[PDB]
């Protein structure tokens, strides 16, 4: 089997990715965020803390006749970027792009903290990270792609995320048609649950390539680019009147300047990021000073290839037995 389904951006910054879902008999579609940094299905639902709902699609179990409640289970995730959801569990059928799991974990929040309920446009997760991230208890579930692993043509999944526009999730196949060149392979750690790599260096708009080895993670759910900070200090310094502010809580940059690439190595293959996909507009409405989409990684405690990077390439995130992730231009 196979799925393909357009995934589109929340908002004109491309802050992050939806892409619809159908969960349940008869289908009840909601739009997640699909998140190669973690490994829960979860959802807003009739559950929910009614307060903590603001415009989000809900899913509502008891509306479903393929639902089952999952007894005694119960899940808790925090995000890297301080949020956080809580409920209960139940199986049911979810289906992607024309892909149908049967008895998927759909995690049904009763709690989410605020900066979910602020934003109306997602209406719930779905981790695609590996499975021993898994939050729920007392029996840690599977995400849908390792569900649906078995059934697929070939066991991938690949990420085709678009600069302020739709792209393209694929399970099961790798469409030719998608990337120029080829795609570089590389090794994968799942030591930490992520889909973990080391990239092989970077360059500076037209400089140099400084060959030197990068740990990181390909993260979908992850809006920017976070890197070490002798990286970061570099790239800025390339770009006349920015600085790392404080209280703001990283680098700005006036939009007057002219914004040079930034490119990553995947083995001796290069991935070119343009300038523009490295502004993310304005820090309030009305002001000069513009929010820089590269940004220090120092205290995160990990590197994170999040979507400015990611949507620079045609990703493929291999889940064979040794897995590995695949990257090439597009």
């Keep these: 089997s196979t799925g393909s389904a357009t995934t589109t951006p929340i908002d004109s910054l491309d802050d992050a990715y939806i892409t619809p879902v159908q969960i ?22 009739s559950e929910t803390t ?19 409640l999952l007894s005694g289970a119960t899940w808790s995730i925090s995000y890297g970027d301080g949020s956080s959801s809580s409920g209960d569990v ?20 009763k709690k989410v ?18 499975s021993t991230l898994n939050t729920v208890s007392p029996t840690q579930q599977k995400t849908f792609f390792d569900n649906a692993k078995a059934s697929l043509d070939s066991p991938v999944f690949t990420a085709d995320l678009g600069y302020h526009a739709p792209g393209t999730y694929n399970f099961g196949f790798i469409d030719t048609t998608a990337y120029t060149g ?30 030197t080895s990068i740990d990181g993670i390909a993260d979908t759910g992850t809006t920017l680019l ?27 940059f006036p939009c007057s300047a002219t914004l040079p690439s930034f490119t ?17 507009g304005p820090i309030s409405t009305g002001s000069s000073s ?26 493929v995130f291999n889940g064979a037995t040794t897995p590995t992730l695949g990257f090439a231009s597009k």
Excluded: H, M
Excluded at 50 to 67: F, H, L, N
Excluded at 90 to 109: K, P, R
Excluded at 264 to 280: E, H, Q, T
């Design 226 to 252: 976070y890197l070490p900070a002798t990286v970061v200090s570099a790239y800025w310094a390339q770009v006349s009147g920015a600085k790392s502010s404080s209280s703001v809580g990283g680098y700005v």
């Design 182 to 211: 080829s795609i570089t392979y590389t090794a994968v750690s799942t030591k930490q649950g992520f889909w973990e790599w080391t990239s092989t260096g970077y360059a500076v708009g037209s400089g140099t390539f400084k060959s």
């Design 113 to 130: 903290s605020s900066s979910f309920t602020e934003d109306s446009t997602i209406d719930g997760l779905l981790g695609l990270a590996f």
């Design 50 to 68: 009614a307060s903590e709902v603001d415009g989000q699609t809900i899913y509502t179990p008891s509306k479903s006749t393929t639902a089952k």
């Design 264 to 280: 990553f190595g995947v083995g001796s293959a290069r991935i070119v990021i343009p300038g523009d996909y490295i502004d993310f």
């Design 24 to 45: 349940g008999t008869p289908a009840q579609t909601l739009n997640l965020d699909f998140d190669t940094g973690s490994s829960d299905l979860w959802v807003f639902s």
């Design 290 to 315: 513009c929010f820089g989409g590269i940004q220090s990684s120092a205290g995160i405690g990990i590197n994170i290839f999040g979507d400015v990077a990611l949507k620079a390439a045609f990703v």
């Design 90 to 109: 139940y199986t049911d059928t979810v289906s992607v792009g024309g892909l149908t799991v049967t008895g998927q974990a759909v995690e049904s929040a």
